[PDB]
């Protein structure tokens, strides 16, 4: 069980750790988060009480180093940093634990929600989508644009999601225009799965990461990426049976977790209606269709 200490909390802030969140008061003696489950990526995220604009946060894996948070009064944010001195870090963490100035990652034993949202998400794949190779953790915020959004402006601070475009030469084989446009199996199975992602795990990993960035930071480009990757599978007549069964589980936990009040801005009516009711896979997502119909029947 791993720890992300905080130097201090000089500004009032809502702190997120995965799907959990805590209010911290200006200069509250808060020194971080302990008992973080090893084996998963995690995201620590922030919304200042004084600027409910710019949600921002850090994807990290405690197996990859010793990370702490320290407020930077110049840049005006909570920054993740790596402590290379293992002894200095253990000494810092032991003191803060002894003084009980840390919140405990509040996982219920029965509860597989975080595992189910992050099953295929790997830090090494996050670091390719969010390029900043001098750090072992990845910064994301509300306003970061995707490589695809930048085509239709600062490449350094972009989300490098795989570009999916249903009306592109990549998506459409010369002389199979109608076939490839109405049945996207070629695009999914040969171009994306065999060509770019290499396997369904990497594809689901990107899908899951796009969802989480959409949900935690209200990142619009991430929301577009999550929907495009769903729609590419649902619009393919030929999908491995294991991918459909897993997709149904992935989407079920995402819909289950989404705040009820954000359904209107995070869920694309057209895509969900098409995927559940019109698409080739309209009858392949039983769990997802049942939770959507019971939780968001307005959208449909």
């Amino acid at each position: 069980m791993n720890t992300v200490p905080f130097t201090s909390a000089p500004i009032e802030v809502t702190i997120g750790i995965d799907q959990y969140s805590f209010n911290v008061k200006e200069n509250q003696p808060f020194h971080g988060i302990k008992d973080i489950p090893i084996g998963h990526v995690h995201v620590i995220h922030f919304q200042h009480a004084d600027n409910s604009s710019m949600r921002y946060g850090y994807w990290f894996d405690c197996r990859m180093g010793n990370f702490y948070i320290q407020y930077d009064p110049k840049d005006g944010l909570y920054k993740m940093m790596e402590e290379r001195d293992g002894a200095k870090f253990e000494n810092i963490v032991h003191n803060f634990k002894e003084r009980q100035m840390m919140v405990s990652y509040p996982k219920i034993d029965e509860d597989d929600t975080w595992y189910n949202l992050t099953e295929f998400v790997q830090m090494d794949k996050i670091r390719k989508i969010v390029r900043k190779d001098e750090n072992q953790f990845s910064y994301v915020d509300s306003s970061m644009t995707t490589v695809q959004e930048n085509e239709l402006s600062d490449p350094a601070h972009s989300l490098n999601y795989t570009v999916i475009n249903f009306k592109s030469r990549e998506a459409i084989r010369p002389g199979h225009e109608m076939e490839d446009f109405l049945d996207k199996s070629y695009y999914l199975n040969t171009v994306m799965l065999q060509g770019i992602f290499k396997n369904s795990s990497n594809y689901f990993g990107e899908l899951q990461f796009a969802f989480l960035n959409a949900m935690f930071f209200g990142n619009y480009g991430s929301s577009l990426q999550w929907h495009a990757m769903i729609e590419l599978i649902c619009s393919s007549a030929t999908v491995p049976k294991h991918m459909l069964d897993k997709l149904d589980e992935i989407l079920y936990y995402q819909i289950k977790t989404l705040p009820e009040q954000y359904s209107d801005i995070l869920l694309n009516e057209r895509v969900w209606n098409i995927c559940l009711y019109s698409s080739f896979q309209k009858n392949s997502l039983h769990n997802t269709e049942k939770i959507m119909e019971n939780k968001y029947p307005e959208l449909l």
Partner: protein, 237 residues
């Protein structure tokens, strides 16, 4: 974006453009079978692809053989249209390729956009205009070449005959749309108006009669009267 009454003069500028109408691509007769079920029998169709500036009509005849053993023909008809328009653009020298293609029905946008991905600089546009190009098969010489085709065939016409020697492309397009609107509203009445005076003939290389300027004004008046009458009848106004 969409072509409408507000950007109408764009049709007559020096940017090459084509209207594509797919209405007459997939045509059927509905009939009773011996068992008293209903069946369709396809008849020959055509893509109506028109340069509104020059009057050049690229009439691609769609032979019934293209539907043999195909499913969802009304959907295939949009894709076959888009394939044939794409083939036509590729067949034209670069300096003759259109800068815009305007589709008369929105269901043609995706099929045409997907077939024209090789031409990212050609703008595919819908229109707000209710253009009567569906009535093209009421022009005797166009109907005749479609119904006689025994194979796929492209036939080239000038839908304005020699009008551009005397009038602008704006006026030529207004006359064409009034003639087609009349033929669409009441074909029999429209055709009676066009042919009632046997002294005015259709040249072998033309589609419409050889009206003087004065006779065109009278003809144009008779077609507007036909359209308003039929409107009062349609709507009990």
């Amino acid at each position: 974006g969409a072509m409408n009454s507000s950007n109408y003069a764009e049709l007559f500028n020096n940017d090459i453009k084509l209207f594509v109408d797919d209405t007459n691509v997939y045509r059927v007769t509905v009939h009773k079978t011996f068992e008293g079920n209903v069946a369709t029998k396809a008849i020959n169709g055509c893509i109506f692809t028109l340069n509104p500036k020059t009057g050049h009509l690229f009439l691609k005849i769609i032979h019934t053989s293209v539907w043999a053993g195909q499913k969802r023909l009304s959907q295939l008809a949009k894709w076959k249209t888009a394939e044939e328009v794409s083939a036509l653009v590729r067949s034209l020298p670069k300096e003759e390729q259109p800068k815009q293609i305007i589709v008369t029905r929105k269901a043609m946008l995706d099929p045409l956009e997907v077939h024209m991905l090789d031409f990212p600089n050609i703008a595919i546009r819908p229109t707000e205009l209710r253009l009567p190009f569906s009535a093209a098969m009421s022009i005797d010489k166009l109907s005749d070449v479609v119904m006689k085709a025994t194979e796929p065939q492209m036939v080239l016409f000038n839908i304005y005959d020699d009008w551009l020697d005397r009038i602008s492309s704006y006026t030529a397009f207004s006359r064409l749309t009034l003639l087609l609107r009349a033929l669409k509203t009441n074909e029999e009445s429209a055709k009676m108006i066009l042919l009632s005076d046997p002294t005015i003939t259709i040249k072998s290389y033309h589609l419409w009669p050889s009206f003087t300027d004065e006779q065109w004004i009278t003809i144009e008046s008779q077609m507007r009267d036909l359209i308003l009458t039929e409107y009062g009848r349609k709507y009990n106004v």
